[PDB]
Amino acid sequence: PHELTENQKNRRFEVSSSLILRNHNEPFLDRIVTCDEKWILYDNPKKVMVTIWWSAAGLIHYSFLNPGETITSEKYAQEIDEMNQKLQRLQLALVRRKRPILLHDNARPHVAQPTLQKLNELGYEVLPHPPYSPDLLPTNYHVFKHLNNFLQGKRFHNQQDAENAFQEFVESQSTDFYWTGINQLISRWQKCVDCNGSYFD
């Protein structure tokens, strides 16, 4: 946060380095499914949280919670289940399929037992992720970065208008938008290693 501690930098360096090496030896970028949550303000209740799930192939699933509501582990487990059904439908026509790997952050609902049991049940390996590293999370450094630009200066009276604006943002992206975001992971891991685990931007 305000300043990475020595240990926090070490953990970032460690994980980034291993992910680069792992990917070099056995490429896994195209198996990654990633996700995150964001508050969408009506003016930018009066807040609705969106969660979004995606891979290099494209958008997989997103859903809004009830206004003002925050996500729980039981509900994340539910979303995981919904996402996974949607994912299975997308892979329907692939000539060659391999199990997905989840990349998400250590948010507390993300790291609790109902969620973990669900990931284990569905067969999702979870990628190592060091704390305080939004700069290594593609939903944060890529999707939400661009969403913020898109939202900046808009107003909404209703949740409908907010959700509608979110859908327009989705519908507005190039087909390769997610693909590009995931491709960025390697240079970001490398930059982290290059800065000895500090932030780099």
Q: What is the length of the chain? A: 201
Complex with a second copy: residue 26 or 171, whichever CB lies closer: 26
Sheet with 125-126, edge to edge strand ranges? 58-64, 47-55, 32-41, 101-103, 125-126
Structure tokens at 197: 């685990």
Contacts of 38 (CB under 8 A, 6+ apart): 49, 50, 52, 144, 147
Reported in sequence order, the residue ranges of the chain that DSSP labels E, i.e. its strands, are 32-41, 47-55, 58-64, 101-103, 125-126
Residues 201 and 135 sit within 8 Å (Cβ to Cβ):
yes
Complex with a second copy: residue 35 or 40, whichever CB lies closer: 35
Query: Nearest approach, Cβ of 26 to a second copy (angstroms)?
Result: 6
Complex with a second copy: residue 58 or 114, whichever CB lies closer: 114
Query: Nearest approach, Cβ of 171 to a second copy (angstroms)?
Result: 31
104-137 burial: b if 16+ Cβ within 10 Å, else e: bbeeebbeeebbeebbeebebeebebbebbeebb
Q: Is 36 annotated as a binding residue?
A: yes
Helix (H, G, I), strand (E, B) or coil at 145: helix
Residues 41 and 161 sit within 8 Å (Cβ to Cβ):
no
Complex with Ca ion: residue 135 or 163, whichever CB lies closer: 135
Query: Nearest approach, Cβ of 10 to a second copy (angstroms)?
Result: 6
Complex with a second copy: residue 48 or 83, whichever CB lies closer: 83
Q: Which one of Ca ion, a second copy, none is in contact with 59 (Cβ closer than 5 to 8 A by kind)?
A: none
Q: Count CB atoms within 10 A of the CB of residue 63.
A: 16
Query: Nearest approach, Cβ of 36 to Ca ion (angstroms)?
Result: 5
Q: Which one of Ca ion, a second copy, none is in contact with 111 (Cβ closer than 5 to 8 A by kind)?
A: a second copy
Q: Is 105 annotated as a binding residue?
A: yes
Stretch that binds Ca ion, among 48-56, 97-105, 118-126, 148-156 (CB under 5 A): 97-105
- Contact set with a second copy (CB under 8 A): 6-7, 10-11, 13-14, 17-18, 21-22, 24-26, 98-99, 106, 111-113, 116-117, 119-120, 123-126, 128, 193, 196-197
Q: Which residues bind Ca ion (CB under 5 A)?
A: 36, 105
Q: Which residues are annotated as a binding site for Mg(2+)?
A: 36, 105
